[PDB]
Amino acid sequence: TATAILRRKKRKRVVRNNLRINNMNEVGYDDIGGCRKQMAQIREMVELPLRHPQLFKAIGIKPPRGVLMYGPPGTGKTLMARAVANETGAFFFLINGPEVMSKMAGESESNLRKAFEEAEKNAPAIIFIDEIDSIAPKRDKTNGEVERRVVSQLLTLMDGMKARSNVVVIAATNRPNSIDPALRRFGRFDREVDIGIPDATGRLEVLRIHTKNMKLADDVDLEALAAETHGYVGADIASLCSEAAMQQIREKMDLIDLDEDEIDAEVLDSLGVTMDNFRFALGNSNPSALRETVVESVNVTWDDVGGLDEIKEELKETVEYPVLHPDQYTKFGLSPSKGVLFYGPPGTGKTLLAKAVATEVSANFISVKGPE
Amino acid sequence: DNMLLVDDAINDDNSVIAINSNTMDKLELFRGDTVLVKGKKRKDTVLIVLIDDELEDGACRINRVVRNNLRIRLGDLVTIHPCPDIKYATRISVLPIADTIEGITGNLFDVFLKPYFVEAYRPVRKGDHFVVRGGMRQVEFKVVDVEPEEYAVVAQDTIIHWEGEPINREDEENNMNEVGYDDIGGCRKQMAQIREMVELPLRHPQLFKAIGIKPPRGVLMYGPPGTGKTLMARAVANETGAFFFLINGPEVMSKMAGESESNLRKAFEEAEKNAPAIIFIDEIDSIAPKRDKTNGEVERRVVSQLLTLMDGMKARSNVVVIAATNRPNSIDPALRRFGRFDREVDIGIPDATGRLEVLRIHTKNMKLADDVDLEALAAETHGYVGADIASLCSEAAMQQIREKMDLIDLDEDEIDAEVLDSLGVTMDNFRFALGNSNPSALRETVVESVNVTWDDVGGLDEIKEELKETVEYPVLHPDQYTKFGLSPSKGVLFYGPPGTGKTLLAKAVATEVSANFISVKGPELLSMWYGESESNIRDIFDKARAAAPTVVFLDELDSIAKDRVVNQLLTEMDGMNAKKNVFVIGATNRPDQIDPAILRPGRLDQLIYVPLPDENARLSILNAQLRKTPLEPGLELTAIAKATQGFSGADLLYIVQRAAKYAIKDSIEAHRQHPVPYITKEHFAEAMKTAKRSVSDAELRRYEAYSQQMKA
Amino acid sequence: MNEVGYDDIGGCRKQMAQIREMVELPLRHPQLFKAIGIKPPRGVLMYGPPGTGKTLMARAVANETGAFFFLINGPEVMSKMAGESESNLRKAFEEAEKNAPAIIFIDEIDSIAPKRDKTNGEVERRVVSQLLTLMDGMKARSNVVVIAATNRPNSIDPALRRFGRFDREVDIGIPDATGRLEVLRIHTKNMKLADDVDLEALAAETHGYVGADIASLCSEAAMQQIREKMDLIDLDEDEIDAEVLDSLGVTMDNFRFALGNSNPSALRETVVESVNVTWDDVGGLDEIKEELKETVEYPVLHPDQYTKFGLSPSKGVLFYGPPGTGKTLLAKAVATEVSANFISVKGPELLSMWYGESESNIRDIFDKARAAAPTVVFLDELDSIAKDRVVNQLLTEMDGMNAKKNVFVIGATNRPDQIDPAILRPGRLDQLIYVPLPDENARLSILNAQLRKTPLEPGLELTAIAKATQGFSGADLLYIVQRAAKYAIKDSIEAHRQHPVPYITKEHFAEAMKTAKRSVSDAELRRYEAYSQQMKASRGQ
Numbered sequence A: 001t002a003t004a005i006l007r008r009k010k011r012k013r014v015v016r017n018n019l020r021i022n023n024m025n026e027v028g029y030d031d032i033g034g035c036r037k038q039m040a041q042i043r044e045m046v047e048l049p050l051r052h053p054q055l056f057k058a059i060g061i062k063p064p065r066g067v068l069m070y071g072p073p074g075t076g077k078t079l080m081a082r083a084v085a086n087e088t089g090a091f092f093f094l095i096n097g098p099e100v101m102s103k104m105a106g107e108s109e110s111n112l113r114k115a116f117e118e119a120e121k122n123a124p125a126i127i128f129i130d131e132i133d134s135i136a137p138k139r140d141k142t143n144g145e146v147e148r149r150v151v152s153q154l155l156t157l158m159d160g161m162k163a164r165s166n167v168v169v170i171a172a173t174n175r176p177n178s179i180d181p182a183l184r185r186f187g188r189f190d191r192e193v194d195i196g197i198p199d200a201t202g203r204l205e206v207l208r209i210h211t212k213n214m215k216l217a218d219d220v221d222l223e224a225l226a227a228e229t230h231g232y233v234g235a236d237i238a239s240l241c242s243e244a245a246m247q248q249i250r251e252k253m254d255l256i257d258l259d260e261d262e263i264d265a266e267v268l269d270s271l272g273v274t275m276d277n278f279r280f281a282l283g284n285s286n287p288s289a290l291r292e293t294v295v296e297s298v299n300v301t302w303d304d305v306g307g308l309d310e311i312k313e314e315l316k317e318t319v320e321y322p323v324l325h326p327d328q329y330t331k332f333g334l335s336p337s338k339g340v341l342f343y344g345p346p347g348t349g350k351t352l353l354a355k356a357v358a359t360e361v362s363a364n365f366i367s368v369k370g371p372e
Numbered sequence B: 001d002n003m004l005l006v007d008d009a010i011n012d013d014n015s016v017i018a019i020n021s022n023t024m025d026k027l028e029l030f031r032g033d034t035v036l037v038k039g040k041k042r043k044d045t046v047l048i049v050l051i052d053d054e055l056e057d058g059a060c061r062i063n064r065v066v067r068n069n070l071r072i073r074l075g076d077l078v079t080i081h082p083c084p085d086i087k088y089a090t091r092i093s094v095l096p097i098a099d100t101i102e103g104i105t106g107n108l109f110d111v112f113l114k115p116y117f118v119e120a121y122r123p124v125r126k127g128d129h130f131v132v133r134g135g136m137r138q139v140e141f142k143v144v145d146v147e148p149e150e151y152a153v154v155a156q157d158t159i160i161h162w163e164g165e166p167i168n169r170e171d172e173e174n175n176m177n178e179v180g181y182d183d184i185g186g187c188r189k190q191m192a193q194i195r196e197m198v199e200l201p202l203r204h205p206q207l208f209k210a211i212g213i214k215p216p217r218g219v220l221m222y223g224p225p226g227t228g229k230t231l232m233a234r235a236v237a238n239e240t241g242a243f244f245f246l247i248n249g250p251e252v253m254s255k256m257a258g259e260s261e262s263n264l265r266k267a268f269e270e271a272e273k274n275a276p277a278i279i280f281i282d283e284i285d286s287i288a289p290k291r292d293k294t295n296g297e298v299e300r301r302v303v304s305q306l307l308t309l310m311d312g313m314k315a316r317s318n319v320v321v322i323a324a325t326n327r328p329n330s331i332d333p334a335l336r337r338f339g340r341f342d343r344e345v346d347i348g349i350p351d352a353t354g355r356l357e358v359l360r361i362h363t364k365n366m367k368l369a370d371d372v373d374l375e376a377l378a379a380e381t382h383g384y385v386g387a388d389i390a391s392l393c394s395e396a397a398m399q400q401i402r403e404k405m406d407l408i409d410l411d412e413d414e415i416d417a418e419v420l421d422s423l424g425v426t427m428d429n430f431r432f433a434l435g436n437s438n439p440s441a442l443r444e445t446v447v448e449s450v451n452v453t454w455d456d457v458g459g460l461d462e463i464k465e466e467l468k469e470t471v472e473y474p475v476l477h478p479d480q481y482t483k484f485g486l487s488p489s490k491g492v493l494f495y496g497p498p499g500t501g502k503t504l505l506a507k508a509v510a511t512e513v514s515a516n517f518i519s520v521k522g523p524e525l526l527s528m529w530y531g532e533s534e535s536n537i538r539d540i541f542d543k544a545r546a547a548a549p550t551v552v553f554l555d556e557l558d559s560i561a562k563d564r565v566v567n568q569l570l571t572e573m574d575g576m577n578a579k580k581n582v583f584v585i586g587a588t589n590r591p592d593q594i595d596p597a598i599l600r601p602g603r604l605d606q607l608i609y610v611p612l613p614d615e616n617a618r619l620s621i622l623n624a625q626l627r628k629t630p631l632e633p634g635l636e637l638t639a640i641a642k643a644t645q646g647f648s649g650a651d652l653l654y655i656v657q658r659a660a661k662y663a664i665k666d667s668i669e670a671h672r673q674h675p676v677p678y679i680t681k682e683h684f685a686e687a688m689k690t691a692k693r694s695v696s697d698a699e700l701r702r703y704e705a706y707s708q709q710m711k712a
Numbered sequence C: 001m002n003e004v005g006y007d008d009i010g011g012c013r014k015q016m017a018q019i020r021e022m023v024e025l026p027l028r029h030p031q032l033f034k035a036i037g038i039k040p041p042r043g044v045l046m047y048g049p050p051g052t053g054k055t056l057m058a059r060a061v062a063n064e065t066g067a068f069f070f071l072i073n074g075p076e077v078m079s080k081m082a083g084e085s086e087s088n089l090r091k092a093f094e095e096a097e098k099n100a101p102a103i104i105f106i107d108e109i110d111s112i113a114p115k116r117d118k119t120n121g122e123v124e125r126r127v128v129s130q131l132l133t134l135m136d137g138m139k140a141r142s143n144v145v146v147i148a149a150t151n152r153p154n155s156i157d158p159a160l161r162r163f164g165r166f167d168r169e170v171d172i173g174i175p176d177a178t179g180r181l182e183v184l185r186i187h188t189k190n191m192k193l194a195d196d197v198d199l200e201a202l203a204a205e206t207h208g209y210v211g212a213d214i215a216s217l218c219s220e221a222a223m224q225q226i227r228e229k230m231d232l233i234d235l236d237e238d239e240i241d242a243e244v245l246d247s248l249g250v251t252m253d254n255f256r257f258a259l260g261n262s263n264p265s266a267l268r269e270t271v272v273e274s275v276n277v278t279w280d281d282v283g284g285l286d287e288i289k290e291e292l293k294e295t296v297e298y299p300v301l302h303p304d305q306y307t308k309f310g311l312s313p314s315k316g317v318l319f320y321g322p323p324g325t326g327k328t329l330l331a332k333a334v335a336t337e338v339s340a341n342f343i344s345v346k347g348p349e350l351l352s353m354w355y356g357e358s359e360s361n362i363r364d365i366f367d368k369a370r371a372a373a374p375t376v377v378f379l380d381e382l383d384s385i386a387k388d389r390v391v392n393q394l395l396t397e398m399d400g401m402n403a404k405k406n407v408f409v410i411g412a413t414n415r416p417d418q419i420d421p422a423i424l425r426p427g428r429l430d431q432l433i434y435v436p437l438p439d440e441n442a443r444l445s446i447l448n449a450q451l452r453k454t455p456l457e458p459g460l461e462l463t464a465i466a467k468a469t470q471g472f473s474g475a476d477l478l479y480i481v482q483r484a485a486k487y488a489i490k491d492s493i494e495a496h497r498q499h500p501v502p503y504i505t506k507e508h509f510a511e512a513m514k515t516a517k518r519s520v521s522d523a524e525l526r527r528y529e530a531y532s533q534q535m536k537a538s539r540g541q
C-alpha cells in the first residue's frame, strides 16, 4: 500500500565506472529527490503493466494506460519521465510538442502515425509526448484547420491504441486546463499526477544531487541554504549553483590572465566555492514559480501560534477525525463537513491556523491570495 | 420440439449431440444423422445426432467446446433442425491455436489430427473449434477455411492444409467486439426503444409492406459521455446480425482535405450494396458541429457531404443510421428534421438497480473475496456512470495489488505462483477506490430517476392531494380529460421558507407517475445567464421532450427571475405540446421578486405555499432521518418535537448531525483512551444547547401575509 | 420516385395556383406572350417553414408541365472540391438552356448564397459571383424558369432579389383544418385503417402541424399498432404468420398516442397562418365590431369608392384595455371577414428580436406579410419594447409600405401611456380603440361559446353565474369553467375507482365559483377609464 514499490545501476575504479557505481543520460532514480510520492505513483502505473503483465491476467482487469503529469515548469517532469523510461528499459519513443509542430503542413500527422505504429510493433513501449499542450491546446485557442487535424489524429490514435498491446502513453503539461478537454476521458489520459514545489527536505536533496561535483569549500552549510531557499524549484536551485560558481570564478579572476589561452594549473586547482558566493547567488536569483498557484507542503504545528485552544479543538474535531478515523464516520453514516470560514481582526494568524490544519492531516496546501 | 435442455456430454466428441429416444422420434431423425443447432445470438453449428435413452425428455448432451462455440452454458436452450444436405469438404485449411502449441514438436498434423480424422466424418463449419488429445497433451484447432462452404463433412477425400501462423487465442475477443444484450445493464427502456426501431425494419421487413408505411430511418442517441452509447449500438448491431459499419468522427475528421468526403461516400455506398446494414456514426458532433463553432471551408464541406449522403438514402431501404453525441444543441440544426434523424433517444445516469447490474457485469472475471456487499456499493455510489464504475473496479484491483506488493519482489520476470493464487479484493479496496473516484456526470444537467414515495414527506397532506389531482389524473387517465376536452395544467410553483422539503416533494411527484426527473439548480441558471455554461435552456427542454414523461425542477428561480434567460424559458414553455407530459415545477423564496410574466395562465401559475412542518411533521422527519443510525433504546422524540417549534427540516437535520458528531467524538476519544454504539439522549441535549432556528420571524410573517393576500 | 402530380398535394390551392399560373403559361403557351408582347418573369422564390412541401410542389409542377427538368441541391453543390461548384453550376445551366423548355430548382439556395455577413470565406464569394453571373446571363436565354426554395426570405443574399432575378416571391404558410384533412387522406390511402377512424377529428385536433409532421404522425401511429400487435409476434421466427400479418390494423387510439408522442415546431417561429373566426366567438362590443368592419372591410371589398374619393385607408390600429378582453380573437375575426391571412408576433418574440438571438427579424416579418398579401400583422404587448432599435426598425418598416397593398398592423398593449408617442402619429398605429370588460349578456354569450364542446346537465341556467361575475374578464370565466370541469373529472375518477358522472352539474359550478377572483384590480380599471375619458376629451368636441 502507499509508496510500496520504492522499497527494495541503470541496468548496467574502472569496474566501478563501467558499472556506474556531456550526454550522460539514463539518469536513474538516484538523480531525483524530493518527489517521492509522485515518483512512486509513476513507477507503480508504468512498471507493473510492462515488467509484470501477468498479474492483471491473474486478477482479470484492464490496466489504465493514459498518464498525465502536470506542474509548474522546471519541476523536472522531463527528468522523471526519462528516468522512468531508462529504468524500465523498454522501447522508448520520444515525441516533443514544438518539434512536431515545426514540420510542414501535412507532415506533423504522419509522424504521429508512424510513431504509434512503431511503438505498437516493438512492444513493450513507452511514449512520452512532451509538451502535449503545443499539439493540443484549448479548443478556443486554435481555429486553424491544421490545429484541429493534429488533435483529431492524436485522439484517433489514442483510442485505437487501447488494446492488449503493452504500450503506455505519458504526457506533460504545465497547465492542466490548457489541454483539450476531450483528451481527459475514459480510455485516454485519465490518471493525473500533480508535481508540486519541494519542501526543505526536497530542496536539500536537490542541492546535494547538483552539488556533488563542484569544488565546494569546507565552509559550506547546505542545510542553511535549504532552509533559506523557499519556493525554489529544482531548476532555480541548479541556476543558483551555477551563479555561485560563476561568482567564485569572477572573484578569482584577479590572478587569471585572460589574454593567455591557458592558465596556471595551481590557479585552476585552487577554485573553491564559499558560502558568501552562495549568498550572493541567492541575492541575484529570482524564482517565478510562486507567480502562479502551486502545491506545497507545510510544517506548522500547534506551537508557533498562541492561545485559541477552543478554536484548535474545534478545527481538530472538524478535520482530523474525518481523516484519521473515517471508519467511525461511516459507522455513524455522517459525512464530514466540507469547508470552514475564519473571521476576525486582521493579523490574528489565520494563515498559520490553516497551515497547522494542513500539517496535522499531512495534506498539501494550496493558497489563493487576494491579488489572485 | 426443437427446443431441448442442455446437458454435459460424457464423451469427448465436439461434433456429437445426444438426444432422447422419444425426442429423436419427435424430431424424426436417425442415429448418426447430422443436425444443425443454433444457440444464443447468431452462432450455430452442426453436430452428429446420437441416441441416448438415459437423456430425459426434452434434453440433450453437448460438451464444453460446443457450449463455448454457441456462447451458451449448461441448461440453456437451442434450436435443432435436420441437416441431411451437409456435403463433404473437398479442401479445408485449419491452423492450431498458439497457446495450444507451446513447445509441442513433431508433425502436429499426423500426431493429432490424423487419429482424429481417420474416417471420423465429423461435421465442420466456418469458425468452429475442436480439441484433440494426443499423447499426454491436448491441442485445439479452428476451422480457418473450408470448400465447399459453409458447413460440410471432413471425410478421407478432404485435403487438409495445416500450414499457417498459429491462431493466438487472445485476439479472438481482444481485437473483436462480440457483445450481446447480456453485456448491457441498467438501461432497458432505451434498449427496447432502439430495438423496436432497428430490428423490426430489418428482421421483419414485410410487416411495413403489409401495413404500407415507410419506417423511420435516422436515429439520434445522446446523453452524458461514458454511458455506453457506443456499447449499446454495438450490441444492437451484433444481435440484429445484419452487416455493421462504423464511421468514427475524429477518424473521418483527421485526414487530408478532400479525403474525408471520400471516406464517407465509400462507407455509405458499401452499406448500400450490402442491404440490410447498420451505419453507426460515433461522435457526430465532431464532424457536424454547430455553425458558430466551425467556419472553415473544409469543416462545412464535410457537413454538406454528410447531408447529401443522408438525404440520398431515404429511397433505398434496409439501412438505418445511428448517431451519438453529448448534447442535442451540439450539432448543426439542419440534421434534426424530417428524413434526417427523426427519432431521438436520451440516455441518463442509471439507478441503484442499474448500478448493481453494471457491477455484476463488470465483476464477473475479477477474483472478489467472499465479503463483498455489491448492494451496499450500489446504494453508496450515486451519480456514477458505467465508465466511472469500471474505473472504480480497476482502482480497487490496483489497490489490492499494491497491498499484495509487500510479499513480492520487483526483480525477475516471473512471480511466485502462491502469491498469484492469493489475489482477492476486499471491501476496503472498494471503499478506497470510491474515495479516489472522480465522477463528473453531475457537473452538467442529466436525466435520472427517483424512488421517493409519499413516505418521507411529513405533513402538508392537502398539498399532496392537490399535487395528485394536478399530476396523476392527466397522465394515468387522459381519457376523462379528452371526454371533457380539458387540456391539463402544465406546471406548478412552490413558494415558502427554504429547506421545507420542496426538492423531495418534486421528486415524489415525479415518482408517482413513474417519470424521469431533471434538475436545474441556481448555479446552473447563473452559468447559463453569463453564457459560460455548456448547456442551454433549449437543450434542457429538448432532453425533457426526448425522455418524456419528465419533471423539470427549477430550484431558486428568483436568482434569475428578478431578461435573456427568462425570455428563453418563457419561449420554451410556450412552445410546448399539450399532450406531452412534461411538467415544470419551480421553487423560490421571494415570490414577490419573481417576474409576473411567468405567473400568467398556461405557465407556472398554480402557486403553492409550503408551510413550516408541524409537530407531527417534525416527528416524522426525525423518525425518517434517524432510520439508519443506532439510537439509544427508549428515546422519546415528542419532547424534541414540542421544543423544536419554528424549526425547518434542515434545522432538524443539523441538530441530528451535531448530536451524531458529539457521539462519535465521545466514542473516538474513549477508543483512543484504550464501547459507544448508541447515541444517548444527552447527545441530543448537547446538540440542542447550541442549536437554533435559521428562519427569522419577520420572514415567516411576511410569507404568511403574502399567502393571506393571495387567498383574499 | 416521380410522377407526383397535383393529386399528391392538398390544402395549398392558393400557392399552387400562383406557381402554376406563373410557370405553365411561359412554357405551355409561349405564343401568348408573343401576342401580347410582354416579357414573362423568370425568377421564382418560394420560401416558408421547413417540411411544408416546397420541393414536392416544384416536382409536381415540373412533372405536370411535362418539360425537361433539372434538380440542383445546395448541399451537394457546396460539397464538391474547390473550383468544382462553379463547373457544376455552369454545366447544369448550359444543359437546361440546351433542352428548352426547361425548369431549374435550386433547392436550399440559402446554403450556397447565404447572407453576406456569413460569407467571410473566399469560396463563398466565388460561388455567389458565379451564380449571379449565370442568372444575369440567362436573360438572353428563354423558355427557362428558375425556382428556388429557402427557409426564410432574409437568409439569401439581397443581391438575388432584384429585377431579372428571383423577383416573384411565394410564401408557404401552415395549412388549416381542410388542408390537414386533405393531407391525412392523401397519406392514408394505403394503410389498413380500421373502420373506427375519425380522420376529421384528427384534423380538428392537430393544429399547427406541417405536412411532414402529419406524415410522421401517421408513421408513428402505424408503429404503435405494430408494437401493440407484436404480442402475437416472436422475433425468433423468420417467417411471419399470414393470419397475424393480415390481422394488423390501425385504430383511433393509435393516432391519439401518436399525437401524444409528437414534436411540432412550425409555430416556434412566426409563420403565416389562416384563421376562420367569425362574429360569434366574441360577444358584445357591437360598436367596436361595426367600427372595425367599416375601417377594414370597405377598403378591401370596395376600393372603388375610396378611389372615387381618393381616401387612403388607414394602415394599422391599436387596441388598449384590461388584459384578457379578447383582443386577439377580435383581430382574428377582423382578418377572417376580409379573407386575409394572419401573422402573430408575441412579446417574447419581440424581446428575442431585441436581443438578436432569434433567426427572424422585423424586416423578414413584413416581407412575408407583403408576399402573403392581404394579411393582418398582430403585434402583442408592445409595451415590453416601447418601454429603441426595435421601435426604430418597426417605424421604418411601417412607413415604407405600399398604400395599395392590404397590410394592416394591429397592436395590443395594456400601457398606452408608456407607448412611445412616435408610434401614434398619423400614418401609423394612430387609431386607438378601448376594449372594455364584457357585459352581462357578453358574459353569458362567452360562457355558452366555451361550453359548446362540453356536455351539460339540462336545466343548468348560467344567468345566475353571469350576474355573479361583474367585472370578470373572459380569462376569469374560462378559469371558472375549467375548474368546474376539473372538479367534475375528479368526482368521476373517484367514482370509477370506487367502482356514473357523465356530465357537469350545477353543484360543480357552484364549487368552482366559490373560489373565484377578479383578475383586474379596481385601481387598474380606474386608471384605464380615466385614460379613456382623457382621450375622449382629446377628440370629443
Ligand SMILES: Nc1ncnc2c1ncn2[C@@H]1O[C@H](COP(=O)(O)OP(=O)(O)OP(=O)(O)O)[C@@H](O)[C@H]1O
Pocket: A031, A032, A033, A034, A072, A073, A074, A075, A076, A077, A078, A079, A080, A130, A131, A172, A206, A209, A233, A234, A235, A238
Ligand atoms: N529532483 C529534481 N527536481 C527538479 N529538478 C531537478 C531535479 N533533479 C535535477 N533537476 C534539474 O532541474 C531541471 C529540470 O529540467 P527539466 O527539463 O526536467 O524540466 P521541465 O520543466 O520538467 O521540462 P520540460 O521542458 O520538458 O517541460 C534540470 O536542471 C535538472 O537538472
Ligand SMILES: Nc1ncnc2c1ncn2[C@@H]1O[C@H](COP(=O)(O)OP(=O)(O)OP(=O)(O)O)[C@@H](O)[C@H]1O
Pocket: B183, B184, B185, B186, B187, B224, B225, B226, B227, B228, B229, B230, B231, B282, B283, B324, B358, B361, B385, B386, B387, B390
Ligand atoms: N450498461 C452500461 N452502461 C454504461 N457503461 C457500460 C455498460 N455496460 C458496460 N459499460 C462499460 O462502460 C464503458 C462505456 O464505454 P464507451 O466508450 O462504450 O461509452 P460511451 O459513452 O457510449 O462512448 P463514446 O461516447 O466515447 O463513444 C465501457 O467500459 C463499457 O464496458
Ligand SMILES: Nc1ncnc2c1ncn2[C@@H]1O[C@H](COP(=O)(O)OP(=O)(O)OP(=O)(O)O)[C@@H](O)[C@H]1O
Pocket: C008, C009, C010, C011, C012, C049, C050, C051, C052, C053, C054, C055, C056, C057, C107, C108, C149, C183, C186, C210, C211, C212, C215
Ligand atoms: N400537400 C402536402 N404538403 C406538404 N407535404 C406533403 C403534402 N403531401 C405529402 N407531403 C409530405 O410531406 C413531406 C414534405 O417534405 P418536403 O421535402 O417536400 O418538404 P420541404 O421542406 O419543402 O423540402 P426541402 O427543404 O428538403 O426541399 C414529404 O413527406 C411529402 O411526402
Ligand SMILES: Nc1ncnc2c1ncn2[C@@H]1O[C@H](COP(=O)(O)OP(=O)(O)O)[C@@H](O)[C@H]1O
Pocket: A304, A305, A306, A307, A346, A347, A348, A349, A350, A351, A352
Ligand atoms: N498567534 C498569533 N497571533 C497573531 N499573529 C501571529 C500569531 N503567530 C504568528 N503571527 C504573525 O502573524 C503574521 C501573519 O498574520 P495572518 O493573520 O496569518 O495573516 P493576515 O495578517 O493577512 O490575516 C505573521 O507574520 C506571523 O509572524
Ligand SMILES: Nc1ncnc2c1ncn2[C@@H]1O[C@H](COP(=O)(O)OP(=O)(O)O)[C@@H](O)[C@H]1O
Pocket: B456, B457, B458, B459, B498, B499, B500, B501, B502, B503, B504, B613, B621, B648, B649, B650, B651, B653
Ligand atoms: N417533508 C419534509 N419537509 C421538510 N424537510 C424535510 C422533509 N423531509 C425531509 N426533510 C429534511 O429537511 C431538509 C430540508 O432541505 P431540502 O428540502 O433538501 O431543501 P429545499 O426545501 O430548499 O428544497 C431535507 O434535506 C431533509 O433532510
Ligand SMILES: Nc1ncnc2c1ncn2[C@@H]1O[C@H](COP(=O)(O)OP(=O)(O)O)[C@@H](O)[C@H]1O
Pocket: C281, C282, C283, C284, C322, C323, C324, C325, C326, C327, C328, C329, C412, C438, C442, C446, C450, C473, C474, C475, C478
Ligand atoms: N367576448 C370576449 N371577451 C373577453 N374574452 C373572451 C371573449 N370571447 C372569448 N374570450 C376568451 O379570451 C381569451 C383570450 O384572451 P386575450 O384577450 O387574448 O388575452 P390578452 O388580453 O392577454 O391578449 C380566450 O381564451 C377566450 O376564451
